[model samples]
Target: SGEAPLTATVDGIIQPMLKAYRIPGMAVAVLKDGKAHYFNYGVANRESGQRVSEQTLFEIGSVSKTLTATLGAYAAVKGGFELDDKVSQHAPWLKGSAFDGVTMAELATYSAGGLPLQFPDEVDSNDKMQTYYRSWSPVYPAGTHRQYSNPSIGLFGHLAANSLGQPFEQLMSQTLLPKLGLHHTYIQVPESAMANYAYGYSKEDKPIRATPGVLAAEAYGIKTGSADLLKFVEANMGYQGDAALKSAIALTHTGFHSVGEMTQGLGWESYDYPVTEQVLLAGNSPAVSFQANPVTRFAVPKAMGEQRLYNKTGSTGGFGAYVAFVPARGIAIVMLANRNYPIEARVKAAHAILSQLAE
Candidate 1:
């Protein structure tokens, strides 16, 4: 049975956002006290008029980096490689390149000098990708700045798969997702589930999905529904699961660098708990996401001790998603929409809902 109060609160917040952003469909899930509450609105596809449901999948964009980080952490726990190992150690083709000095930790934390937010347009093929890394140089020395990059984390996941002796998607789908009990999550949505995959709408109202490219799957190519995504939230909050997998998940939460008000973890970004909306907005602001910011590297990774608000935002040309949770509060929120909207709006809405639930 659903809690009427929770549903009402979600409706009051989500319905208006749907209208305001002209989103075609949305799914929201709130996890509280180990229970999950889900809400769905609008059509998954405007032409087909398929209504949004718990099974409807939305592309999570760069939020996929969190899962990539998990895979890297899992690889480390499995003895595939050490986090401190040089990137070229696993991918020997990078041996003579700038990556010779980069470590897995630096790539996962976006602190490997200065990888751009996205690879250059010419880097559309694997050969070009290799050449790009071969010639690339860092703007900042490793561990001194935060750049928020796909290639940085993308290479982290790629080399992780390399060390594990498996393809990135294979390792993730066969090992990680199953261990986490996420049956519906996928880097490649299978044909059987294609009907449930929501069509993301571009700014011009044209239907779109993320295009395949170098490291696309590793970087920004996860698709899942609200229920499965909430399950992931629960796992991250220390729900019972595979022992090693849980350990790896915990590793991702360890703070590696601090940029402004944000504490950069492997794939997640965190703030001291009881964070203000202004602080969250500033931390997730364009300047932080797109510009280089100086960071203070922890001598040792900082541990998460129940006083952190962990969150991430993801977007493709057509879709936008946000996830935030406080482990100490035993509460989390996830929002997925078929239209890309402002990060500020997503944060504000989720903040309101979370604040209400915390009350």
Candidate 2:
């Protein structure tokens, strides 16, 4: 573990390790300069008899936040909003909940009033999602704590989009993704790509299929193929044309607050040990159990130390997905799965793989 291994020879060890971990499918995009050093393994699904290929898209769940947040950052640089502007500055009705005192930047960092990890049960019912935004209140004070609250960071995306007078996904597709050439990345599946998308599953004693909800739009609602995600990584590494790429990537890497000892950046969570890292992933849905499971952890690391890895994870009921790219090291790797494996080991194995390839 001290010296990084010869990456050319490391594949022999990685391919089997991935299989031993029961990873149904995985796709990696590496950066030698700008182009991808690409690799794909396993199947996209077990039931459909589909093969895992660079074109198979998987739901990246919470990792969707960074994509969405990147849009927010773009909006900021374009003069749509300031990062530290108050939420009330954008949505007046959200005032009473004290969510207004929290700046847009804080909301991006999951520090906005330390909202619970989710919105109140009262808000889950309808399409006018913002109609319910006022019903929820923050559990921790603004700028005081970090709890990895998705609903809050998510709401920020909604507000940012509304302030722009456009749907969030529209902004992503028309600008963000295109800028990165992520032609297939999206929060909602287009009618055409439905068949090519991967399926999600439960790893229960008796496994079950996942039920991904439309409500996850602001949280974990994106599907992208390995190629598209590789393009995404390339953008983060500035291989793409955006001059903002460094700051955009930096937005997800800044540590703002904490959940116990862990830190969070704008919509990203940072873990300090075993190589400092940040995760843009979500816990499996109804996260109650995933939170309770002590052995649970999830992340994707692209590089370490000088410019540590920044990544995110996604899972709906049965499917799991990951995306990570290190801007400093110029490497990116993504993984998607059909089964809901334990979060901890998945990340550890992925990190080990990254470490193996670091040299």
Best by TM-score: 1
Clashing residue pairs in candidate 2 (N, C-alpha, C atoms within 3 angstroms):
61-220, 109-266, 200-319, 201-318, 201-319, 202-318, 280-312, 281-312, 281-313, 297-344
Q: Across residues 1-359, which tens digit of lDDT does each residue of candidate 1 receive?
A: 34459889999989998999899999999988678988999999999999999789999888888889888999999988888888889897999888888888999999999999999999998999999999998999888988999899998999898898999999999999998889999988889999899999999999997548789988999999989988888988875767778888899889998988899998989999888999999999998999898898789887766788999999999999999999998889999999999999999998888887777
Superposition error at 307 for model 1 (Å): 1.7
Q: Which window of ten consecutive residues has the lowest lDDT sum in model 2?
A: 289-298
What candidate 1 gets wrong by more than 4 Å, as runs, is 1-4
Clash count for each candidate, listed in order shown: 0, 10
| Candidate 2 local lDDT, 76-185, one digit each (tens) | 76677887788888887777657667788777866554456655565655545567566656665666654566676777777777777888878777877777777887
Question: Could you give me the TM-score of model 1 versus the true structure?
Answer: 0.97
In angstroms, the error of model 2 at 244 is: 5.6
Name the weakest run of 10 consecutive residues (lDDT summed) in model 1: 1-10
